[PDB]
Amino acid sequence: NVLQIVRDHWVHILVPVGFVFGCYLDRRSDEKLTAFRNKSLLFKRELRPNEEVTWK
Amino acid sequence: PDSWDKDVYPEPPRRTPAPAPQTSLPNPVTYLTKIFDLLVDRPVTLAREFIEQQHAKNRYYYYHREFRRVPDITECEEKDILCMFEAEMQWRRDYKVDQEIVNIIQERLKACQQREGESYRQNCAKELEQFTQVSKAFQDRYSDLGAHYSARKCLAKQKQRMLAERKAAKEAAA
Amino acid sequence: MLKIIIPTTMLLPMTWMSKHNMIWINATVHSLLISLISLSLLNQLGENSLNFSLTFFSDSLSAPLLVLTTWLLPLMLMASQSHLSKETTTRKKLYITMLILLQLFLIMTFTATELILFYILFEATLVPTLIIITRWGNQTERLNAGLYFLFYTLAGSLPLLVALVYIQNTTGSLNFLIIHYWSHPLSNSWSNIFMWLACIMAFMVKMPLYGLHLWLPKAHVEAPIAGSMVLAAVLLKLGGYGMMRITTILNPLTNYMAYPFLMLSMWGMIMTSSICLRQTDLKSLIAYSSVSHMALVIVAIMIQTPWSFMGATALMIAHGLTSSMLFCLANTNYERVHSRTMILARGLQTLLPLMATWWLVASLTNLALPPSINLIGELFIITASFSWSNITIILMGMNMMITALYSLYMLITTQRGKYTHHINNIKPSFTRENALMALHILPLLLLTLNPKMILGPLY
Amino acid sequence: IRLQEDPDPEDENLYEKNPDSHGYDKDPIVDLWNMRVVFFFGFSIVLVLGSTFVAYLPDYRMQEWARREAERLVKYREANGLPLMESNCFDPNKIQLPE
Amino acid sequence: MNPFASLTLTTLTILTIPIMMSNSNIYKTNLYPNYVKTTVSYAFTLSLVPLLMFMHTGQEMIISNWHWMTLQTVELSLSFKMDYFSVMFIPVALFVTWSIMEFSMWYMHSDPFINRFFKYLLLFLITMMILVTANNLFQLFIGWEGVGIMSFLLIGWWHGRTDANTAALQAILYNRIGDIGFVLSMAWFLTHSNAWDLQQIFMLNNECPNMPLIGLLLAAAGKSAQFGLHPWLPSAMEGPTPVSALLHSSTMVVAGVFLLIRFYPLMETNKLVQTMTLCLGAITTLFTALCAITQNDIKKIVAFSTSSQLGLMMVTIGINQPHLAFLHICMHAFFKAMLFMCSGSIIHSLNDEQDIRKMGGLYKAMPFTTTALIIGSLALTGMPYLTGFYSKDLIIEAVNMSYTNAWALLMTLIATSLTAAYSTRIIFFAFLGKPRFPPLVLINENNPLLINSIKRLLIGSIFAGFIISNNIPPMTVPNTTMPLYMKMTALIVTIMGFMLALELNNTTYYLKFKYPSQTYKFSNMLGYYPSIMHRLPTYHNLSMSQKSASSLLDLIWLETILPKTTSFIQMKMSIMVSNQKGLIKLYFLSFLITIMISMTLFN
């Protein structure tokens, strides 16, 4: 029945949720390297009225 | 056409002689050109008119990115990693721009050779000299840096060249 | 890089928790999905690399190799499911686990930002390969092949570990960005000569260099089909990637220390092509062709010019694809007649037409046929070698002639002529085998269409 | 004989039981769906979608940007009589040679 | 826009179109050969239009439609050069291919893979068009190798024939030597000029040097079967008669001559390379005609005639007459294609017999092929107003009137005489006399396809020379003033060859028998070149491939040095260490020695 389909095809979400978790951890790693955000001589600028950070 | 800059990509004025027939025989080239214009040019022109009308309704724009100048490897202190990074990136961008300048000059040279045709050795002497000068400068700049080239290595090469020139001038004055 | 790394570590439990008859389907589908995800790494910058975090970074050299690895995994799955029909469920899952671990180690190797982590991962790649060879090889010689492979690699690589820790002690860091920015010239001394030797010899053994290559026929001939595919397509490219990475700190000593390696590479390229001319085994012929192509790549890396590195990258990608396809074709033939002798099966064009077409296309790509990326890389390497010296053209021309000779010799021997009369068990080609060949060949032609994606950072 | 060993089994043909076999699995339904997933995902998804994605990858290598910058520099330098390609990459005034 | 570029690219694209339909029900049916032939005819007319455009005002163009990749300062783009050479050779090649395809519709009716045969012919045509219209060295090399592999595939059409496989691989080998030369030229040009396109190559190479020009000459010799790399062309007769007629003789063996023509400014700038080209062409034409005059296989005779004409073209290039070589390319394509078609009709009508010793009586047995072959042989030998007259006569006049190599001039004249000789041999042994074929007479040449194809290539063999010569602009200064005997030299030597060969052939009817001469043995066995040069170098290379590289080095000494010696040393040391009797007296004496040594030698 429906239960057996979920009982057998529940492994098809492992790789997608791993991809989602990898994207989340990539964001987490990126947010720790924000010490020169809007501080490089090349890309330094004044913030727009409705923004807090240049990138995330 | 306004697509490209006529000054950056010069074209000599086009001088086309007028037809001066000497026979009563019809011109098959003229007849086939009329057929081509009737059968191909008009349909493609109508199709492009429709496509451009569709494009004009959804006009939107894209921009050319501007980079401000940053201090170079000469101004950077020793093992000042951030300044070295900025200077290296700027040097790489300038290297790409110079490569494209050389490409533009080479395109000029090829176009002039093809255009002048059988009189290219004389009429293309102006584009050959510009190519010679541009290639000489580009070679002196980035001739033998290697696979792992960098702004530091290019600066060392320039320093070596300057030392050689100074020694030559001193020897000449001696 | 975690968005690609984590899905492989999730391929593992999915493989171990799927049903007995669904392991191949699930592994193939999710490997293809991971390859599609990894296709996003090709969007590289013209100035610098993609620095995701402190541990991983991607470049125009790493991206095509990662895409090639992720694309190669499902093809290996198809071949393995071909030849592992009677295996138990646990051993099937163990084989899939070995393949998954190898892919994960290769990804982390290509994206590692430090030389010591790169060393750890590129040495970790040995264990799954050794297990696969010595466990699922068909013949007795698999044990000797594994011993040769392991000991060649380790005797090459241990001095590299010593040199890496010494360089870290001397300079303060093994981070690739730091060692590239803070690089200093290498003076002509015995100590610097031996440091250069340690690094270059490790990667040369990995290449392999001529005179250090017997392990390659040993392992490639005796490994299973998936092992043969991964050994030639990707594992031979670790040496080239490493040499293109370490040579930053080895200047200007590379101008003087590269002569013996260049001479070995050129002459052994000629010699291995000639050996290919007289091979009674098809797998051995493919392996020696791989040796010749990697010798050409070594020549490119040693001459070390921007035109040589682009050719090296293109030739590495092209050789990976072509050698994988050739091994797959030879393995289908072996699965037919249960023997690797080239002259045993003949008339295979009149017995199997579309496989004859696949053989023809694979052989035409094996030799440098324009405008294939094989020819693009080979021609760039030949032009750089011509700028280096003007007798390298003589050597390259000889090698190209012999390459065409042995490729067409293999094609004519296997496909043309009249069929063997007593071989009457050659069933029609399977949809799986045809799909394997198509998936091997189409990306190569698309890369020919778009060539700037495999020309490396020097483009 | 020196052992109690099994005889070497005969080669198994997938077409005998299933004439329309794709060569994936002994089970007909499993083999058919293996063929379907392989063909669909690999060919359609990976080949077509990845190929068009790579074809339409944005110009992050700044090839066209470099060409436009080169056009501007050539125009400016040929308008003012300056050399099109400068002789030095850096400033000799900012470079200090040893005595 | 000017219709010139559009129509040229349209001809190329419509040539490529039927290949896309090779995965369709039409490819699965029997209408595919007619479909391909119709497409080729339409392409022929569509290419005739730009020829009219050029012959009016001399319009020439280059079209760089698609940009491929930029290696820093070098840009490679898909560029086509639509100049006099391209716009003249495209319609001629299309006309020849159309005729050959109709002749193959008749000729290859019983082939199970006639659709694949026509697909391969169209692919060869596409690759040859790429080679001809290519504007840069990389695209020229694409066309080069494409026609090479198509020749390889079509020579080995019957895959079960070991001789066919050998001929295909031999052609590949010689063309790969030529490609060695080609790649040398490409590398030199890129390194020394930062370009692979003809415009910048011509601009920068005001005095082109020996290395690039000799690379080009080597490639041309390899592709055009000059002496040293010649034998693959006669061996290429293993393929079906349509392949021999279209690919090799008419359109593909002229690839080397065309390559040398495309770099005629550099060839003008050089002199030593011109001398080398002249000498190579002279020896090639003389040797190949000398081999031709004594062959008993009609396809072999026609192949050696093609090789001799290629040598004559190379002679023409060597005397700094690039445009005369192109004119001869066109005329030779016409009449040599027709001659091959006539020989193929003879072969088909006599049940796959290719021996003139078994032919005979065909003058009245086969009327139309007889008249077509007579017209072609008259055009081949330079009948005073036929298609071959407008090129060969001017070539001979230029050779006699220039500052040339005396031996090259003499060999060219002797080669013209031998051309007349072997044409007489073909006619005499194939058409005159009494039948020598089996009694069951199956001769029937009444097929409209064959008749119409030979007709179309027959009108060109009479009138095309006049039209082409009178419509092209003057590109060289004529040799108006010359002695009368030098003016008539070509005709005189042609007639002398005719007469001597006719007398020698007439002596065969005598009831007189004599063992052959050494000169006859040398000429009939192709100068012994294929024997020695196909048995000795091949044996030595294949023997060194196994005895030295494989066994002696790979399997013996590379194993002995690094891995085997180390393993032996480790085994010996392991045995030495582990070989102990387990005696406490022995190893306690060892302990005492160790203690004494540590006490004394260590401080």
Ligand SMILES: CCCCCCCCCCCCCCCCCC(=O)OC[C@H](COP(=O)([O-])OCC(O)COP(=O)([O-])OC[C@@H](COC(=O)CCCCCCCCCCCCCCCCC)OC(=O)CCCCCCCCCCCCCCCCC)OC(=O)CCCCCCCCCCCCCCCCC
């Ligand atoms: C190291 C040397 C390097 C030399 C490099 C230079 C080579 C130059 C070659 C010149 C051309 C040689 C042609 C003959 C060789 C092939 C003979 C052969 O096998 O024929 C069988 C073959 C028949 O095949 P088959 O049906 O199997 O018959 C079996 C044989 O009957 C079976 O009977 P067989 O086996 O007895 O038949 C052969 C026998 C019969 O063939 C002939 O007699 C052919 C005679 C051709 C005409 C030669 C005299 C031309 C006189 C022209 C006078 C006017 C000049 C212009 C000025 C006029 C106003 C002053 O020939 C000979 O015994 C010698 C013929 C001449 C050889 C020349 C090369 C010498 C090599 C070294 C010396 C060897 C000497 C001893 C021989 C070997 C040991 C015994 O003959 C033909 O198909 C016709 C041959 C061609 C006839 C016309 C040739 C015209 C062009 C040459 C003459 C020059 C004309 C003017 C040119 C322009 C000047 C400005």
Ligand SMILES: CCCCCCCC/C=C/CCCCCCCC(=O)OC[C@H](COP(=O)(O)OCCN)OC(=O)CCCCCCC/C=C/CCCCCCCC
């Ligand atoms: C620049 C480097 C290359 C220089 C030349 C190297 C020569 C090396 C010879 C190749 C080694 C052969 C390996 C295997 C080749 C394929 C196997 C083979 O032997 O095929 C034999 C095959 C069959 O013989 P048949 O006559 O058809 O008899 C059939 C009867 N049923 O014959 C061949 O194809 C062999 C031909 C090889 C020719 C070798 C010499 C070539 C001449 C080169 C020197 C001339 C240079 C030209 C100068 C040009 C001037 C600018």
